[PDB]
Design a protein around this nucleic acid. Structure first.
Lengths: 125, 260, 207
RNA sequence: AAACUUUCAGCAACGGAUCUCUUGGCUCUCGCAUCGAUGAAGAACGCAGCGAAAUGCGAUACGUAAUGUGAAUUGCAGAAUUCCGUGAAUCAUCGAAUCUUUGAACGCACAUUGCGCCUUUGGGUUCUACCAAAGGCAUGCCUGUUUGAGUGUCAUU
RNA sequence: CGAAACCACAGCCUGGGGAACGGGCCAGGCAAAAUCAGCGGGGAAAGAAGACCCUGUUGAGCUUGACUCUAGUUUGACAUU
RNA sequence: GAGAAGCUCAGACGAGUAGGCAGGCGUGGAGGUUUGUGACGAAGCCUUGGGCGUGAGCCUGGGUCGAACAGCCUCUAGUGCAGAUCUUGGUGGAAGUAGCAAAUAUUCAAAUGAGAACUUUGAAGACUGAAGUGGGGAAAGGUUCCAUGUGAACAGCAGUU
RNA sequence: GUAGAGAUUCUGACGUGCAAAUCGAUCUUCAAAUUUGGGUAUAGGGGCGAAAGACUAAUCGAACCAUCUAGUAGCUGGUUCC
RNA sequence: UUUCAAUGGCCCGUCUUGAAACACGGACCAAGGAGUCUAGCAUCUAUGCGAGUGUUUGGGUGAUGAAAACCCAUCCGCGAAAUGAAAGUGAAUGCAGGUGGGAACGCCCUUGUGGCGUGCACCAUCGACCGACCCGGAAUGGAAGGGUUUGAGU
RNA sequence: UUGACCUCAAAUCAGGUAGGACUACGCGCUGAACUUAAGCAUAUCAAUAAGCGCAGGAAAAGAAAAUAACCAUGAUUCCCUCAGUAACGGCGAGUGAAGCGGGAAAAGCUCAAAUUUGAAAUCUGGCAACAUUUCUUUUGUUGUCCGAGUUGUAAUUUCAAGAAGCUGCUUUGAGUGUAGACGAUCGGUCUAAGUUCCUUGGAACAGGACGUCAGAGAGGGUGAGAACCCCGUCUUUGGUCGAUUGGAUAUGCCAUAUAAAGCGCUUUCGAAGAGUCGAGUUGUUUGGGAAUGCAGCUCUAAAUGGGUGGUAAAUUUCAUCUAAAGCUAAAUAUUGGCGAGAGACCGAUAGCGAACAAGUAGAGUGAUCGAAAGAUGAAAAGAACUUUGAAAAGAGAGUUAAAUAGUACGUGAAAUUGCUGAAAGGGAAGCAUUGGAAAUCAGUCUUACCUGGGUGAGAUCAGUAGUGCGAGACUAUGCAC
């Protein structure tokens, strides 16, 4: 149960904030859990998703599909992963968007900002 | 309440008779769907509702303090009756004793794990399981108004001193923790139905006499308050009727059923 | 039309009363706001008492002259008798009322004792720390915010439990005294006028 | 007997009721005090690679400076001048700036992008005319400054 | 290519009764699909909460020696003096 | 025992506008309760099947459907429609009916085109007959002006215009 | 008597019209108290009126717009389950 | 369920003495659509307390998480006294009275729709007391004595 | 002739200032009528609507020319009560305060009237210097000069007093740093827990099994009801800036800090607001009644004087206050603006007119008037390709869990319409009762208990009997086989 007077339990307000959040907020919103090995290594439960990230799908029809995040569609809260597509009528390939919470990261895209974020969150590198 | 100007933000006047139209006021002008349409009527689309709701309606109801104390005392006495708890729906079949009084070390609990373990040891966890199983989605439009989930009521833990018991028990579904000095009728008889399962601490149970007093001695925590007197001394009217003193003086038994 | 039992209607609702309706839905909010404000005031003025010392006065009507209530401020005569200057009274938290006056030694002494009790229980912090001047307290270490009325409350006049019956009480006729006093109070002016007119007429006849 | 009409049912139509939702409305409560001649509110005209509306912005124009986060925007692209990098974003924040014509609107007017005046600097032969740029020219009132008026009152010349 | 007015349901007559001239009620004359062009007897046809009359303790325009006032105008007093 | 608010026996009576009272059916929301129903299908809707109640109404079989809903004890209200020349919206008979008849008038051949009575070209016959159906302007309109394409909507017939 | 300006009669056509005042024939006047464009002034108990209570934006014996106003109605209509 | 056959059956609502009316509204269907809330008053009912009753004008637990529940003091509203315009005065002779009916109870009859003793509630009635009015009338006071009266009193 | 003073001008002189917008609340002016009185004129609506002027975060009011009549109270404001009362009112309809009492909050003061006269001690501006900053943006100090000012700027006084005096009493703000903190805080969080298995399902977030966390089972999202998938929720310290005497021995330590106040007895004085008070009349207003307040006009004051003490006048007392000058937070209001938390409210003809590019489209010359319109699907996967057709489109196909979801898209009623099937029909139809005809629907009883009884195996039952005292009951055990 929430107690803070600055915390709103209104469903209307919560939905408005979620569906109207800007790109910076949506980046934090689109977060994926780390694998078990990554959890031991970095002492971090989950991180926001990013491009060039190796993930495997846990839910949905494309379960057990390993791939690297090719793009992050924050406008639609979707992740476009490599080789995760479906055939259109004419034979072209249309990528299938996957929610961030439905995938688990198996290999981070390490950089200065990513390492600084991990250390800031209190995790081993 | 609805807006005070709802249905009035328009300039509509009746056109009278002779136009082969109802005498309801109509919107003037032209060039839009609204032109010529009726207004200001409770029977009219986009009009003013009949008897618009006002904010100065009597929302709050006053009850005499003596009547409130009577209801609270009745709720406490009802909670002390094991049959009423079962009737109200509390799973108290395996409870060791009613009223259930626990040691004062419960007031110093620090973890929900300890609270759950104590409930299991005193066999009061069945109510929590019942509440968890009964949790469902509300039927109707209350979901749209921040009332999505409904569930049953579990045990009511009454304490005297707060040393962590409130925080250790608050996350358990159905469990409500209250101080003994501020017993609430909404919790003691939820829904107007008597027989709420109450778990007392030793200090709270000991202070119950100070809180309520007796019929002849006033409570020290309520100024000049005495417990109500009942209009009947012995409520076992079946025993009184079948007692020897009455059966010795009554007439013949009489036929319960008579032949046609 | 009026055709039912009961008193005739007297409703004063012939104006636009609906636009001046005062609701009380902010009553718990106002109560909380006032409590928070006085808590903030107590914190900011600590360790000074929240409520200043007030005098004991008699209400001005026969309906209430048998009671004692709290006044606005102590009179100049009371402050002088208690040995407190009017300029220093405000600094040490003693209200000053220049309008009230002491017509009776009872009220004068009643308020003077209150000022003396307040002075005795008062701790005056030195203007410069560690340098107690005239009237300052050398033991300001144990200072805390206390209720003024908790040590100096307003007290009502006590009644006498019993006393022996006197012969003057036996011979006193209360109803006859009340009737005679009432008759005297209204006819005394007429009697005095009659005596003056009789004296003037007698002197004029003598002339 | 057909055709026709009527009633019902099954499918197909017309229509958008019912049901379920809702980034909306209404009401209550709590907190705060910040527009403008240093040019407000409002109006007009323009600004994006592809843009009429809404939002934002003003010829530095979906904006510049500065700060924060850290790989996107997305409909199509374009951009690898990108990622061990003080850097993408219609991101967030925001203490420096830009801020068109107007509008209390202020050179005079305005159903006119009309008619003027002053200073300085440059271009066309132009110490004076013309053109261009920059800075200015409203009224009432206040305190001071300067220049004045009065057969209003006063002195030695 | 393509409406509108109108539409309680509908529509063959006589007599009776009836809110005193019925398409429906009662008694009779009768009674056979689906349609075209005219027609003006009937539907007391349609339009328009009768404009005539009356009621309303409902108005408005106008008139006057109706009641109550008023702009203006005349006279006096006081001040300016 | 017979939800004592229960069980049992007997007698009499039954029109009803205006109106009064009582007991019930139905709708939205709230508290309590029902190891309540439900994606193995909730609500809603259709039904030429079934059952119950005097009735308001309720349960159910078969279809469609896709995400919530209900029984009981109380609380509560913007709670029940055939009318109001009621409101909004949709849709009928009239009806393929009234009608698309002022301004003298069109015809032939070719081209284009899927499609020609309305387009274009040529020929013929005509009209406005200089106070014009001619050539320009003021007010008003604002791109209707021109070229190239189109024939979804408009041009109450049609269209290649 | 033409243009222009009007509208006597047919009480013609039409009268869910081409048209919320039009069409045809006929008729009045046609060098002045003529007709008319643009600019301007007069604003509602007011304007203007060769005077009809006429005109004052299809509205005139007191225009239009918003508000008081959900004006009042002893009157008409309606007023929802057993 | 449909249809047939016999018999019966006028179009609903409304104003009205009277409607099928040649009286008005109604072409059809869906959704919406009209005795509500508030300040009072009167009767009745329920609840709590009771010569008292009313916590929420306000203050505290308060910070937690608290528009709630709970607690707390002085006033004040109504009632406990009425009467007169008012100045004023201000309710026990008695078992807080007598009479008649009267619930319930008790005692006797002797089975009668019974006799006796008290007697709640309520009504009727004769009195007593308080205030007002009218008296006698025994400067200021109206105490015993009264009345054919009067009050929304005891 | 000139200068000075006085008055009045001009300047695109130096530096400033006002307008306008917002009006929920606030301070005023002006000001109706509808309506009620069952008519209507006074009255009521209403000291309201409309119009006009003027502010702030609050405004206004405010420290008595106040109540009371008391054992007296004591600035203003607001709440309860006083009280639907006193009172006003064709005394009709109706209207209608105030003292006291309880509570919230409390805070006091400043000028003019004084001779400093042994020294205008006062203030603005220009110039220069030195400081300061929310800040190169802000705010001052010093020196000098010029102006203002003696037709009065400063100091002690404001009636509660105070001055002139008389005699003895005591002597005080600003710079640094630490520990504890306090606003913004944000280097940001140590901040907890399943996305294991089986079934259904397109998708598990559904059901079941095994678990986990909880100071976190509020809420939201994710392909269906998710505490443990994600954002979050709960709990909880700290890097930073600033207010940094806001406090402490704010220590540490600079000069703040030598003469201004302090009470005391005694006297002498004690300046106190003018077309103002007050009186008359008129108009308006009020509950204000021979005038409650305001305003116009006429008259016009006084010094123990003047105001008030709710019935006009005269006279004699008494009580209270000290007008005609000014400031002041708090408790109070807030349908405007900004931010936030909620709801027994409405669920697209509802709720604001506007859930959607709504004060938008559109109408009127104009003031103004002013709508309609939400939902495919989890994901466009938005139907490749073949064929017919000029084309629009159709038929095959294809995607999807679903095309009974194809953008004319959630489900998809009625009115109305087409096809098919059944039935009926001579100038209505519809309905009710009874039955025929045709069509259609349910009644599975002979389940189950039990008598007799053919084949069949089988740890064998009551009666006994042993195992908390009498006795009824029963679980278990050996005989009864």
């Amino acid at each position: 149960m929430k107690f803070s007077r600055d915390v709103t339990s209104s469903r209307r307000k919560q939905r408005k904030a979620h569906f109207g959040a800007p790109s910076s907020v949506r980046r934090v919103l689109m977060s994926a859990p780390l694998s078990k090995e990554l959890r031991e290594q970095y002492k971090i439960r989950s991180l926001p998703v990013r491009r060039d990230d190796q993930i495997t799908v846990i839910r949905g029809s494309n379960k057990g599909r390993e791939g690297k995040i090719t793009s992050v569609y924050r406008k639609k809260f979707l992740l476009l992963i490599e080789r995760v597509t479906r055939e259109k009528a004419n034979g072209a390939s249309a990528p299938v968007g996957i929610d961030a919470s439905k995938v688990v990261i198996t290999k981070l895209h390490l950089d200065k900002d990513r390492k600084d974020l991990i250390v800031r969150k209190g995790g081993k590198v | 309440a609805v807006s005070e100007k709802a249905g009035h933000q328009t300039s509509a006047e009746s056109w009278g008779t002779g136009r082969a139209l109802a005498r309801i006021p109509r919107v003037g002008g032209g060039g839009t769907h609204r032109s010529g349409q009726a207004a200001f009527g409770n029977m009219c689309r986009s009009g003013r509702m009949f008897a618009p709701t006002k904010t100065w309606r009597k929302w709050h109801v006053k009850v005499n303090q003596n009547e409130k104390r009577y209801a609270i005392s009745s709720a406490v006495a009802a909670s002390g009756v094991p049959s009423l708890l079962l009737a109200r729906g509390h799973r108290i079949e395996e409870i060791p004793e009613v009223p259930l009084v626990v040691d004062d070390a419960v007031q110093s609990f620090q973890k929900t794990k300890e609270a759950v373990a104590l409930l299991k040891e005193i066999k009061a966890y069945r109510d929590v399981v019942k509440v968890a199983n009964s949790r469902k989605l509300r039927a109707g439009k209350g979901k749209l108004r921040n009332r999505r989930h409904v569930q049953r009521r579990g045990p009511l833990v009454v304490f005297n001193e707060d040393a962590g018991i409130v925080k250790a028990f608050r996350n358990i579904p159905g469990v409500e923790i209250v101080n003994v000095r501020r017993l609430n009728l909404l919790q003691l008889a939820p829904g107007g139905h008597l027989g709420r399962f109450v778990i007392w601490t030793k200090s709270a149970f000991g202070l119950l006499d100070s809180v309520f007093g007796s019929t002849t001695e006033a409570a020290q925590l309520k100024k000049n308050y005495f417990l109500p007197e009942n209009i009947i001394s012995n409520a076992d009217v079946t025993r009184l009727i079948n007692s020897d003193e009455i059966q010795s003086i009554v007439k013949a038994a009489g036929p319960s059923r008579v032949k046609r | 039309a009026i055709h039912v039992k009961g008193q005739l209607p007297n409703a004063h609702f012939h104006k636009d009363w609906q636009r001046y309706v005062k609701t009380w839905f902010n009553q718990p909010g106002r109560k909380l706001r006032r409590r928070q404000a006085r808590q903030t005031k107590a914190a900011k003025i600590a360790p000074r008492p929240v409520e200043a010392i007030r005098p004991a006065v008699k209400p001005p009507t026969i309906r209430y002259n048998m009671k004692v209530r709290a006044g606005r401020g102590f009179t100049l005569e009371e402050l002088k008798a208690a040995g407190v200057s009017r300029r220093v009274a405000s600094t040490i938290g003693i209200p000053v009322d220049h309008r009230r006056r002491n017509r009776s030694e009872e009220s004068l002494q009643r308020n003077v004792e209150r000022i003396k009790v307040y002075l005795a229980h008062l701790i005056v912090f030195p203007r410069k720390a560690g340098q107690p001047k005239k009237g300052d307290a050398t033991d300001v270490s144990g200072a805390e915010q206390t209720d003024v009325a908790a040590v100096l409350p307003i007290t009502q006049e006590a009644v006498e439990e019993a006393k022996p019956i006197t012969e003057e009480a036996k011979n006193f006729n209360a109803f006859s005294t009340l009737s005679n006093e009432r008759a005297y109070a209204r006819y005394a002016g007429a009697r005095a006028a009659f005596q003056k007119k009789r004296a003037e007429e007698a002197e004029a006849k003598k002339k």
